[PDB]
Ligand binder design. Structure first.
Ligand SMILES: NC(=O)c1ccc[n+]([C@@H]2O[C@H](COP(=O)([O-])OP(=O)(O)OC[C@H]3O[C@@H](n4cnc5c(N)ncnc54)[C@H](O)[C@@H]3O)[C@@H](O)[C@H]2O)c1
Ligand SMILES: NC(=O)c1ccc[n+]([C@@H]2O[C@H](COP(=O)([O-])OP(=O)(O)OC[C@H]3O[C@@H](n4cnc5c(N)ncnc54)[C@H](O)[C@@H]3O)[C@@H](O)[C@H]2O)c1
Ligand SMILES: NC(=O)c1ccc[n+]([C@@H]2O[C@H](COP(=O)([O-])OP(=O)(O)OC[C@H]3O[C@@H](n4cnc5c(N)ncnc54)[C@H](O)[C@@H]3O)[C@@H](O)[C@H]2O)c1
Ligand SMILES: NC(=O)c1ccc[n+]([C@@H]2O[C@H](COP(=O)([O-])OP(=O)(O)OC[C@H]3O[C@@H](n4cnc5c(N)ncnc54)[C@H](O)[C@@H]3O)[C@@H](O)[C@H]2O)c1
Ligand SMILES: NC(=O)c1ccc[n+]([C@@H]2O[C@H](COP(=O)([O-])OP(=O)(O)OC[C@H]3O[C@@H](n4cnc5c(N)ncnc54)[C@H](O)[C@@H]3O)[C@@H](O)[C@H]2O)c1
Ligand SMILES: NC(=O)c1ccc[n+]([C@@H]2O[C@H](COP(=O)([O-])OP(=O)(O)OC[C@H]3O[C@@H](n4cnc5c(N)ncnc54)[C@H](O)[C@@H]3O)[C@@H](O)[C@H]2O)c1
Ligand SMILES: O=C(O)C(=O)C(=O)O
Ligand SMILES: O=C(O)C(=O)C(=O)O
Ligand SMILES: O=C(O)C(=O)C(=O)O
Ligand SMILES: [Mg+2]
Ligand SMILES: [Mg+2]
Ligand SMILES: [Mg+2]
Lengths: 553, 553, 553
């Protein structure tokens, strides 16, 4: 703390509000700049809930709380902490999307770094404009696939912002060690191109080699200022760029892709919980995806990794996996192009080629169904009814976000199958009570349950590169925290209310693995990995800003 | 003060060195940045004299002491206060001239504002670059007539730097409210033009109307930012611009010319004290200047103002005043040009036309003699010898600076006239003991006896303009402080060792005059003019930097 | 650079003087604050040498140039770079000793950090008061053994300040990445305790466990703020604490002791160059040391390392090593205590036990003689003349600092041995021209030829701990640059004039070593170690402070 006076109030990283003690007020030059009352964070919190309770819409509530992050960081996280479960729908999915598609409308103060293609050749100078000088985690996007909402361009910065928020409020990463980034090379969305409030460059997306040079220049500039092992979580890019950049950097930097690997870990964990109820013989496992993109391909590769670790060869495991997209079932020889990653899951066409998804469900007769198209309610009743007929305890997962692009709802799943299903969603749904009294409390298959804890571990361990096994491990660490009681409620995931510890427990496990596999470079190595982790978490409790004053002998 | 940490030590205005208390060091973030020992200004003062004692050259001493002002302001001034009389020939005349003509060689750090003709049109932006924001006094030079040293261009910035030191060291004006300025419009100095160390524009002097507009743009800029009554002391300009600018701005801005008006006040003062020993009849007062420029015409004018107050008509007064320049005696109808200001003292040629200055002395047979030609030892022994024969108690004033251009030395004056002369020099000279044992201690006719005290008065009173009678009053205030004892030693001026109180005393008389003549605008008017002035002087003693801590009931 | 205006000129790290470009002046808010002239660093340097050439005494020159570092860092090192060989005796030995002994008299501004025993419990807050936040190299002292000058207490800070200049002027390490530190736990020097100018705590040295706890708390505090692999070079401590702390830390931190290890590496390299002229049968090597302290024991262990690696067992190698201190020859069973470290060189006494050092020379008849007592001319003419006889080409090494404490002079060594000796001094000595016309050019065995390059490497490779072989290598890397023609002058070391490349070259060798031995953690590993190193050296040429301004398509 080298600053004194008003600046201390202007900076939300330090603004305490009326919680500034008199000692600090007088000693740092704030006396007379604050009301003669000294408050506790406890009161400050009470003020918030009292006010939030009166608000009506979620976008209005979202605007409010997010602004607190602009006024008082400590109280901001204190307020989340007070109840992350009831505030997640506002700050995360589904209302976060609504805010992104409104970003230019609700704009008040910016957040994160903004690098546009028109800045190429000077990406370093921009990075040098960032205030915090010890960043450890970056979350970057270009806004081409914001959830299932599509190309939102610069209005997409609300995603990294929202994600980094969860790093801290979930895994205790330090707010000032995070940096959300947005690369603006344009947007193809005709609509924002005509909008006057738009915050980005008014041009279509540039896909020439100039685009790639920029991300190259971006990655270099970042690591130069902050270090080669700076964590870089890629978020919401377009399918080609997602894998493209993943495979191209995963070996040179400490980077990963949330949509591909993050989602893989979560899904495998819910599926793992489910098996605990089904106990369906490996041999008889058939999985069918709705959509074959970033997320589908990712989960598929992790599902395989786990099936392999349980006998089955890599080849025989993939043959148990099918994918259906917007062009239809992925069978060998089809007209619609099949890419490198899809090949292992592209099989020889069956006897009857499914025209509709219900067809594929009826023909392939899968044990599990996973929605990852982000195209809406494609999990029709005829489908859930079919799955209800083919399998006694069918596995239905609808994970597209937000809730509008969700393949189906919790209500539909449990009622259309007579509560014989094992359900999970990407967005939030409340408990469902059947006409006959049975109550089913679904869980939420969101990578929010994974990236905060993984990131922590990777950071604390000074890891230089991330391998997919880490996510496999992570997934194991998560499901391993599920209790048969929570499970006996319809949950394939531990209560959201406990995502804070769950995340910590996750992070503890991952560091054990990282160190055990010689992937961690933090030295020396802690003897008790647990104490180690808990020791370093950030707290929302105010810190004294008083100068170290003492008398000498 | 609004900041903490190292900056506190980098800034001389606040730097205390080891004099920072422990409570200060701990409460301002300095613990560790200073040795574990706390000192007193007294000790630091001891560190200075011990060191200064070992030095051998005056320019070496100049560079050392001037360097303190850039390290610890308060200590710097405490060191002058310790013995102004011995340091004066180092910081002021004559060593200061040596320094100026060497400004480029000894450069270490700049001081003051630098406005060049190349910045015309953007002089205000320059004025806004100045750190201190409550300037009250300015001393400006363009470097055309640095003492009797001539045109030194930007090397002449040494003068405004020194002059403003005296403001503080002599009259207690605050250091941060002073601003030395230099107008660089080129230099005609052929040698400096070929000097790779010169600090100004490598071009000859611009005398076009562009020169005049620049000064106007400067006078407008200054007053806009700091105020219309900000004091501007013009210093060491060329003859022409000296008068031209004084006449043009004196009734529009709170401005004055030291070389014209300040020099006037000192000389009259010494001329008055003298009269006390001679008591020569007003009727027989004949004066003869060696030089008819800035200083000569300023004295001549003030002399006349008093002669008048004492009877004499303006016309008759002037008739008792002659002038002799580089061309000869100023007589009506001479080849060389005479100007608006000389006319009054340019009289009808005498029976014979003096070819040398000795002839002029022999012909005119003057009572007084005033050297202000800045041309060296023109008061030859034969002249001194002649003055002694013509008068019983002749008056010999050689006021040109620095020492090397003085018209004659004290030893020459006293010895060559058998100790009957009444002498005053512009630069410092020690006591003279004739072969007959008589010891004479001469005084220094220098406006440093004037400007610091008059400037303090105008400022405090919020004066908007300075009339000639203000100096008339300052001269009366100075001499009125001389005691017959010091008088008896041969000094026509209070000892230099008391310049600090003489100055204040002068400031009090003048602040009484201004008020009494409705020229002061400071409100309300102080009852006790003396208590009021001494109440607002700047002290060289360290002030406490501690925040105002205290407990609430 | 985050700040503009005055602050830019007040901080020596950024201050450029009149070299600030007009665009920089206009764009950073310095227009007007600097004279209208734009100077080149080459002009500024010209002013320095011209000013320096006038000065007479070395301590006067020391004050001048060390002052520049507090004015304009960039020019400071350029002035060094311009001729490190001639300014070395002024900035380093012997004139740095003279300055340290008078630190309190010449004090103007402080340097480095100051941790006193009175600050125990708050060393972290003191560390957090340091401006620069990316320190990589520290040099610490307590001032108990400043050279061969003794306990100088806080007046000892002049050593780490000077050591750290070499880091940059020799190896190109970044100035702002360096931090000198002084631990003040008191002083036993009676005189400084009654000196009002002293800069440290007025108390005798505290040697309780409170002393250790402080170093413990210093060590921890430093590594926490700046990182665990931060280089910590220990300098000039007391014999007991030197070794004690070395062995206590060398494996917990990235730390080394320059007096022990540093000097070892330099003495071996001069001794290795010598062997190339003597080619003496390893079997017939007999080494005798004057003194058995920090340095003496240091070279020994390395000498043995070299010997071992060329055959000889640990045992037989140390048998060839004899040490003679203030109590006499170290023989088994003597009164004066022998310590853990001296043992291996504490041999069974000879037939006649030497009383004088001349005896030990005449009894043992050594091939080499190494002066490291720091007690003055103990290498009397009789000893020099005794060596001259016993050996055809004796090796006489007087390494005590400063020059007054040197065991003998170059003039004595060559003259007293007929020029048949191989001499090396701790401090500088010029060439010696015998009566017979022969001219001998001695070399300087000082660890300055070592710590600058060895530190560079350790820093660039992100090394965690320092082994002794590092020095063995660095010692091998230095002598390997000696050219026969140079050897043919009498120099067992490469010219001083090229200390820059030498250091760089040593640095390259050492990093190749670290990488080759799994001690380097910088990743990835460079392909061309040489290009890698030359790549990252700090230059003295000014850098453009201009903001990145560019037009968008
Ligand atoms: N719940 C989570 O944790 C999580 C994490 C990441 C992504 N997602 C969601 O998954 C969805 C897709 O993400 P992605 O990155 O794989 O996208 P993508 O665009 O890369 O892949 C989508 C795939 O679904 C197919 N598809 C589109 N419309 C279809 C339709 N109408 N019928 C059948 N198939 C169709 C596409 O051809 C494509 O192959 C998004 O809505 C996103 O919000 C959820
Ligand atoms: N920290 C600050 O910025 C600060 C602190 C104290 C006073 N002030 C100023 O002083 C004014 C109030 O008047 P005052 O209490 O100074 O006395 P005052 O009103 O009697 O003084 C009259 C004028 O003389 C000036 N002055 C007083 N002492 C001076 C000195 N020693 N050297 C040079 N100039 C001097 C003042 O600035 C003022 O404009 C206010 O207008 C305020 O702006 C500013
Ligand atoms: N003692 C003080 O308090 C004080 C104050 C201001 C100026 N001065 C000194 O007075 C001197 C003149 O200053 P100024 O601004 O009036 O100068 P100026 O250039 O305005 O006038 C100089 C006059 O001296 C005359 N002169 C020059 N050489 C002459 C010579 N060789 N013989 C006869 N006459 C000669 C010139 O003709 C001219 O009339 C300077 O050296 C200056 O340092 C002293
Ligand atoms: N403005 C800044 O704060 C800033 C600017 C540039 C680089 N950096 C740092 O550099 C690191 C990345 O490594 P790199 O690209 O500098 O080189 P590098 O990775 O080759 O160097 C490895 C280590 O040596 C250090 N280093 C490099 N040159 C040095 C020198 N000349 N003197 C002293 N230490 C030196 C670096 O700090 C680094 O920790 C990052 O961790 C980053 O923190 C910081
Ligand atoms: N004021 C400061 O700038 C400051 C203060 C304290 C520590 N540090 C840094 O910490 C390092 C020393 O290690 P340590 O004691 O912090 O722990 P550590 O060495 O056990 O942690 C290893 C790495 O994880 C990072 N880290 C620790 N907790 C983190 C968190 N909660 N969120 C995000 N990143 C976290 C650290 O920066 C470190 O690089 C030093 O390199 C220093 O640069 C800086
Ligand atoms: N040239 C270099 O590179 C370099 C490096 C480090 C130290 N030194 C110098 O070496 C000297 C000693 O350093 P150290 O740290 O080894 O000291 P130390 O105090 O640890 O050891 C000194 C040894 O010399 C002995 N001694 C003292 N006076 C003696 C005397 N009058 N006659 C015989 N023996 C005597 C002592 O008993 C002791 O064993 C110092 O003067 C120091 O300046 C030079
Ligand atoms: O859908 C997305 O965009 C995500 O990254 C997620 O919800 O996990
Ligand atoms: O001579 C000068 O330049 C002066 O202003 C003086 O010394 O009075
Ligand atoms: O003598 C010393 O103290 C040294 O560190 C040296 O000169 O090498
Ligand atoms: Mg996403
Ligand atoms: Mg003048
Ligand atoms: Mg040493």
């Amino acid at each position: 703390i080298k600053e004194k006076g008003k600046p201390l109030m202007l900076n939300p990283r330090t603004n305490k509000g009326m919680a500034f003690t008199l000692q600090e007020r007088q000693m740092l030059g704030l006396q007379g700049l604050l009301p003669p009352k000294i408050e506790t964070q406890d009161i400050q919190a009470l003020r918030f809930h009292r006010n939030l309770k009166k608000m009506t819409s979620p976008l209005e509530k979202y605007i409010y709380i997010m602004g607190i992050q602009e006024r008082n960081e400590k109280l901001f996280y204190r307020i989340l902490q007070d109840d992350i479960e009831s505030l997640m729908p506002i700050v995360y999915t589904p209302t976060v999307g609504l805010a992104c598609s409104q970003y230019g409308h609700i704009f008040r103060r910016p957040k994160g770094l903004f690098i546009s293609i028109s800045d190429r050749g000077h990406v370093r100078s921009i990075v040098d404009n960032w205030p915090e000088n010890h960043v450890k985690a970056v979350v970057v996007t270009d806004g081409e696939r914001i959830l299932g909402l599509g190309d939102l361009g610069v209005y997409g910065m609300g995603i990294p912002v929202g994600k980094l928020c969860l790093y801290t409020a979930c895994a205790g990463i330090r707010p000032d060690r995070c940096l959300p980034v947005c690369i603006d090379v344009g947007t193809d969305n005709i609509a924002l191109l005509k909008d006057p409030f738009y915050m980005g460059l008014y041009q279509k997306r540039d896909r020439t080699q100039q685009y790639d040079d920029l991300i190259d220049e971006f990655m270099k500039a970042i690591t130069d200022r902050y270090g080669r092992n700076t964590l870089i979580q890629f978020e919401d890019f377009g399918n080609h760029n997602a894998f493209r950049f993943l495979r191209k950097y995963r070996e040179k930097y400490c980077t990963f892709n949330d949509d591909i690997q993050g989602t893989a870990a979560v899904a495998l964990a819910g599926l793992l919980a489910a098996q605990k109820v089904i106990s369906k013989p490996i041999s008889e496992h058939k999985i069918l995806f709705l959509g074959a993109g970033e997320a589908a391909l990712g989960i598929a590769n992790l599902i395989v990794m786990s099936m392999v670790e349980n006998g089955l060869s890599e080849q025989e495991a993939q043959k148990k996996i099918w994918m259906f997209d917007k062009y239809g079932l992925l069978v060998k020889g089809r007209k619609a192009k099949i890419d490198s990653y899809q090949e292992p899951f592209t099989h020889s066409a069956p006897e009857s080629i499914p025209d509709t998804f219900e067809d594929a469900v009826n023909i392939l007769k899968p044990s599990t169904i996973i929605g990852v198209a982000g195209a809406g309610r494609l999990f029709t009743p005829d489908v859930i009814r079919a799955m209800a007929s083919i399998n006694e305890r069918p596995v239905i997962f609808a994970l597209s976000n937000p809730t509008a692009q969700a393949e189906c709802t919790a209500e539909e799943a449990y009622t259309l199958t007579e509560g014989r299903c094992l359900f999970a969603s990407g967005s939030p749904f409340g408990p469902v009570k059947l006409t006959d009294g049975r109550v089913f409390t679904p869980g939420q298959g969101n990578n929010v349950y994974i990236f905060p804890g993984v990131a922590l571990a990777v950071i604390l361990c000074n890891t230089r590169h991330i391998s997919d096994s880490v996510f496999l491990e992570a997934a194991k660490a998560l499901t391993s925290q599920l209790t048969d009681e929570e499970l006996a409620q319809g949950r394939l995931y531990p209560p959201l209310a406990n995502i804070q510890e769950v995340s910590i427990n996750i992070a503890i496990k991952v560091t054990e693995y990282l160190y055990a596999n010689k992937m961690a470079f933090r030295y020396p190595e802690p003897e008790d990995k647990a104490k180690y982790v808990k020791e370093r978490t950030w707290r929302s409790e105010y810190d004294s800003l008083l100068p170290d004053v003492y008398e000498w002998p």
